[PDB]
Design a protein around this ligand. Sequence first.
Ligand SMILES: [Mn+2]
Ligand SMILES: [Mn+2]
Ligand SMILES: [Mn+2]
Ligand SMILES: [Mn+2]
Ligand SMILES: [Mn+2]
Ligand SMILES: [Mn+2]
Ligand SMILES: [Mn+2]
Ligand SMILES: [Mn+2]
Ligand SMILES: [Mn+2]
Ligand SMILES: [Mn+2]
Ligand SMILES: [Mn+2]
Ligand SMILES: [Mn+2]
Lengths: 290, 290, 290, 293, 293, 290
Amino acid sequence: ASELRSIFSLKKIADAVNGYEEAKYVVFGIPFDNTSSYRRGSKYAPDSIRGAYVNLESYEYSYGIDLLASGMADLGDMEESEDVEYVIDTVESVVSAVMSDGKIPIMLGGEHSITVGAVRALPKDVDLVIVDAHSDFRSSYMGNKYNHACVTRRALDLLGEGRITSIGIRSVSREEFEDPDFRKVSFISSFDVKKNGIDKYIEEVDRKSRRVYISVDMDGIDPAYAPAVGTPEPFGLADTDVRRLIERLSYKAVGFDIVEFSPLYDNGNTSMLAAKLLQVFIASREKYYK
Amino acid sequence: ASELRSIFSLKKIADAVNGYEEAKYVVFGIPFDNTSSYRRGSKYAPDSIRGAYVNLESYEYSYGIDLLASGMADLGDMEESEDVEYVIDTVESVVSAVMSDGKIPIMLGGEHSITVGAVRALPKDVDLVIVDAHSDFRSSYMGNKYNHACVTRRALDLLGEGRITSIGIRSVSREEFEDPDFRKVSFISSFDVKKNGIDKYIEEVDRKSRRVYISVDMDGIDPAYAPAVGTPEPFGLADTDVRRLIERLSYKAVGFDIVEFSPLYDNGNTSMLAAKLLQVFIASREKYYK
Amino acid sequence: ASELRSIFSLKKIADAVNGYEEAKYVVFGIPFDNTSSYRRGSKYAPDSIRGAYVNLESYEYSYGIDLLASGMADLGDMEESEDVEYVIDTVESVVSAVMSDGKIPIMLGGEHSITVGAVRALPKDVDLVIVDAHSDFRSSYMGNKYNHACVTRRALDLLGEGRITSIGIRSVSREEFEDPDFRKVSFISSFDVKKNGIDKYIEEVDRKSRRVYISVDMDGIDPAYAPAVGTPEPFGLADTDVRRLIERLSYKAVGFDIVEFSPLYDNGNTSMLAAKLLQVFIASREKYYK
Amino acid sequence: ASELRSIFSLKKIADAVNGYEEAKYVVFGIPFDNTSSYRRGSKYAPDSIRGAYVNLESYEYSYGIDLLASGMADLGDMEESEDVEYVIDTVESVVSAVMSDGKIPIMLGGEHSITVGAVRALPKDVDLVIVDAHSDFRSSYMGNKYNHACVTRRALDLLGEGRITSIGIRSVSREEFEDPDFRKVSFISSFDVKKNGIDKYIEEVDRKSRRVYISVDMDGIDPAYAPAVGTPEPFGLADTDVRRLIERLSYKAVGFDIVEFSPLYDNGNTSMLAAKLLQVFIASREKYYKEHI
Amino acid sequence: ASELRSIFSLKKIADAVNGYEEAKYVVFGIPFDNTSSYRRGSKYAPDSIRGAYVNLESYEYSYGIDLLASGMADLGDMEESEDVEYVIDTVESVVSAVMSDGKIPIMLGGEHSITVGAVRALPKDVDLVIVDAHSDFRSSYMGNKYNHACVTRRALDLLGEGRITSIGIRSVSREEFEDPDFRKVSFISSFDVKKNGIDKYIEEVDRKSRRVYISVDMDGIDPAYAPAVGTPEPFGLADTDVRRLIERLSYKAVGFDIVEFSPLYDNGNTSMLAAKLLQVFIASREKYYKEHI
Amino acid sequence: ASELRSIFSLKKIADAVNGYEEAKYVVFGIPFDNTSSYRRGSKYAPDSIRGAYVNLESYEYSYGIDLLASGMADLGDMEESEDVEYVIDTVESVVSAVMSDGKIPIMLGGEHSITVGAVRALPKDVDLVIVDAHSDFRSSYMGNKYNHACVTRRALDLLGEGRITSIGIRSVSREEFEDPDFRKVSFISSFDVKKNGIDKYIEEVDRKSRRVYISVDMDGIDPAYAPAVGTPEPFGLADTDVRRLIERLSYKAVGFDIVEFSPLYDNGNTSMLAAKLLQVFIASREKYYK
Ligand SMILES: [Mn+2]
Ligand SMILES: [Mn+2]
Ligand SMILES: [Mn+2]
Ligand SMILES: [Mn+2]
Ligand SMILES: [Mn+2]
Ligand SMILES: [Mn+2]
Ligand SMILES: [Mn+2]
Ligand SMILES: [Mn+2]
Ligand SMILES: [Mn+2]
Ligand SMILES: [Mn+2]
Ligand SMILES: [Mn+2]
Ligand SMILES: [Mn+2]
């Protein structure tokens, strides 16, 4: 009976051996999809990342870290729901608790809008850093203020100006651009990165900010390195630009998330890049602290 | 921390609420693939069946049973291995234990050859009932006696004549047919079923056998109702023939298994039929005992 | 400029050569999708049906009817929305308007929930005829009484006992089976049909009803024939069982809708089946009024 | 040097072991497609059939015939060409030739219009038996008489009345149905079959004809069994219906072909049925000659 | 009755709001394919482009141009035809016509051979700028002069020397390379670009030509960015390289087209780049006329 | 009968018009696959490369070389086997025989493990050059020392220090990093290449080595360019980095293999890249010996 628990186990991130009590890093999943209009399937993103992860080594070669000894847990997934507001509420209290207990939340989702709940838990020293191809700055979309095209908006409301940066941007609504409050966020385009490099904007954030929260909207990355994103936008960042950003900023991170790609639209390469960025986050941080 | 175990959970069959201790039905998964030459992916079958299952109702309408109150557990999956012999050994001891403890093993696999381990645990009153498009009767295949094209062979060696029946058969090797021992198994073709019906051969088994073990090689079923099978064979059984067989024989079953289909070769309809047959098995049996 | 309109045209059903005024059958799409919790994509089915239509002939062989002279019209799609109530309200209006004008509404939708709007606009002497794998009889699903899992409950409230029949049903939640009002609807299982034939249940309707509305939730059909449906359920009707029903009730029908299949889950076959069901409705009816 | 030819071989039908001269059954591909409108990819069918064959046993259980010892050869594929007339003319020579030598041509194709070729080669006693969802009976299509929707018409031009049957049909253009010549061919609807059984229509042909040529347009079968046909038509024949047709008629068959499916549109199940249907033709024919000769 | 036309509409480019008469930019599809050998499905490109466009914003951030107020119209698609000459002749009339009215034709196609049409309509001052992985510069292919591998050749026949440039090329048949006439066209290799930057070659064209027509053969782009092109060729141009080409040249452009990709071969990313490239042409051109007129 | 052989032919590389005797480059396939534990399908890559080849021209533009007159040969495939050792033994023989005859072996395989056989047949003055994402330096994997995760360990045993260089490496298990013998191989990261360029590492080989063998494990290339590889790893080489290496070492090379990509995981692009790498090897070399 226990000899059976010893032989069989449910699906998990391979290196998340530690339970919650002992974990420095707490990986969890939020299967929410219900405001996405173009491609659907983000619901299934966490699970497919658990799938991809087996192909990965328990040791990170670039950083010289063994993830097996990094203290990761995987709680799994929350109930599927159709209600953005309930989903946001739950994220909020979950992120509170992890952070409160001296741990670092790593949230795997479907949609971007779950990040709103995370922002709600941010203290005043923490600044927000987004990777994204769109400014999610609409006042509302589809009669919902929590449509995943409003996340940058919701974040402004909660944090104020001189607090939020988003990088990769190359899709913006007119309604958004003409808004006065638009200038209250630092929007950095993919074209800017392609011209001046990534380190320049990584510098600005590393100077200005005591602590950070990193949210990765997968579609900021060019479709070539990430085909399965929910809303593809040509001319985007390189997977290495996002690696570099994470690499540099992870020592100051209170929390992390990866959102907005759909396992049903490719054969696994995107969920692979996702699982790998989850590695870069934990490995770069452990090297730093040693 | 416990409020978290209350919100998050790892992937499972939805109705497998009960732990091992309280379960009448013990679902587990065996991710083995390593002798399959044509299509690969059975490794991933159990997981995809967990996936499909959510679309299903917790109540069975045809049998009037609520699976939530049927006492199912899901232990999960065993370690992936390349070694048929190790995999077979482990299956053997697992099946022993469940049966020994008054419970009914329900094994989700990749390859058929894992059934060999199950047979090894069968008492003398139990007879074997297979659904399959091939006689897996080769003496050996690819320098392995445990190649999944030898399962009917291995089963003969263990059980003797007048013990094994396989239904759906429409692919047979010459080497197999010319073997003297071939007649020691009751091979029933799909063509026979299409002519005389299924109930006829279900009758023969229900008369002759005190108890049974049911093993479903998914490819016995016609490709139309099951596209993702590992080795497709046209002109095969109807999904309802297999339903009917299970429906009728489940009250005498000591154990069950579903094998030989690959989630990567279709969009989920096959793993759906699989998950549904898992239902028909438990529901038809609970109705009988009431 | 007018010689251009004669050289280019927008995507249409190739036999819908008549404008509204001069039409007997009015074809329109509803790209609504937003309560489907398994497979998503319904939204795109109208477009795809138009696409499949090109492979069909103008002359339906089995009825000596030429569809190019059947008075068909194609109005395209209604703007996408996330609001169920609002979508239903609009449907109610379009449907009422069209029947008032002595025309017949062929509604190509996404979800089944749009059928509610059609039900609202129905005269005391029209009964509802549904093909479906599920009873769709929930009082409410996922915080909503217009969830597509409720379309039959909603039909009941509008129409009362002895007006609604649903064929193909094999998936029922227990809450629905136990609700007292369940029996006020003639629920016919696919098992009943495979056993007693389809004509038996057709006779039961042709007798008891002066006029009808036909709703095809495409999953009533076995996944062998409609693999692209939103919620597959094995052991279903044959495509020829549905053809037969349409063939037989087409002369009494006031309207007709087709729902619940995501064209993304296959390579065209399902939407071809949907396009052929369309061509059947219009040819069997006209053949009649010859 | 020659040890290498012993280790490596080009791709073919695994049982096609003999050279042409020693072969009874000569399997060959014609990758032609350039008249097909709706789904394209027929060109690759013969290759995909060779690939699926590996999954099949060399011995056919239901006939008790070992295909390895049934005198099969595989010539491979013909060059691709955009010209219909050029292919049809090429087929005709290849069909005539193989029949002269008392061999049995099995033509794996793309489109159905390659069949026209084979029909030019037929003696007066041979009748044509077609499995198809449409009456490819159209005077012309897209400024082409040899367009793959006109195959039946071009067949009637060659054979005349009472020589041609086509089974499974369920899609007909009024221009064909209104032709006086339409009744000069036997058309059996997939609905006929589903109502009267296939055997009835098999019985008629067997009694009437002394020899046949069998042409299988893969879309005559219901899309559930052949999902990857070039022009799908629901409410078709059962995969078993076509098997029974072949089982019962292969002993009189002078030639055979399989056409109009496209491997790009599924994961292999359609080319697997196509390969099985080819086993069935050879095997059931060998069963006849082992029993009655 | 008329309330219904207010609720329902046929599918088109979401921003193509104006009728022809009031339009500056006239977008139209030509679903023609019947010369394409390797991957097929170009026919469906224009439809798939309209479908991806829904994912794009009506306002283009990098140019500060609202497309809804840029005078776009969408005529829809032309009948399908199997005849190359017939389509090319049809295009030529449609291109001439739209240019006469001082409008700007945006031709969404399948194959590249539709471009020939548009080239017949060009005035003497207009030069042709082609993005392509091959030199579709072949005297004939498969007994066809208007075969889609001969587009460049037929272009030279019409314009003569110094009038034509083609960028990104990395696949050439020796029969072309050995032609004396090969040097009468400017061919810039994708390797040239990757070495010297795209701007260099953009500078040359801008200085030389007073006006241009831009033809984008989608396979000139590296398969990483356009996976679903009809004839993929690795080591291609960056998606950004083509954007820069358009950005910089759309103010002189009398016409534009996008061709030779097939939506059947991916999940939408290629038609999404195709739709973005069309936004880029219109937007960057409007930016010029808002700044300098 | 002989006029038939002139009209039909079996699947071949369209420029391999010469028989063995008259050939300088000998192209052969090894459909071996049976130690790959993630994606399976390598086995089919030779066939697919032949298929992609049809889209290529006979004349390679960038080298003024006509491949129809380069003395190429295509021998087809070796019978499938499940035995690694045996496959390797056969490879060893074919490779030795071919180099002895002063011919160059282009081996199109499935797995990387076949390269071992080629390594066995190498003279004291030929160094090994590998493109790969992983170090492949395990002493043994999954109960086997000829697992494809070991191909570099096995290379070392045969060749000793200062003879083996591997470029693109970004995935290393810790056991390999810690083994003392690790440093006896020149391991070049894809990060090193993106930073310092590729030419730097090419110079390092062109100098230190008289002659070489080139092995392309296709996953060394970033999933953007070879999405169909057996084990994807993000942050990799550009396809042009590999082209460059081949361009530069082709004149010293004694053999050349291409491995580790399953054609099932894409729609042709990877095998096109593999076919183009083939055409590069043969054109860059010949251009040279002009
Ligand atoms: Mn976002
Ligand atoms: Mn975004
Ligand atoms: Mn089996
Ligand atoms: Mn089997
Ligand atoms: Mn339903
Ligand atoms: Mn329903
Ligand atoms: Mn035909
Ligand atoms: Mn046909
Ligand atoms: Mn071109
Ligand atoms: Mn091109
Ligand atoms: Mn590797
Ligand atoms: Mn390797």
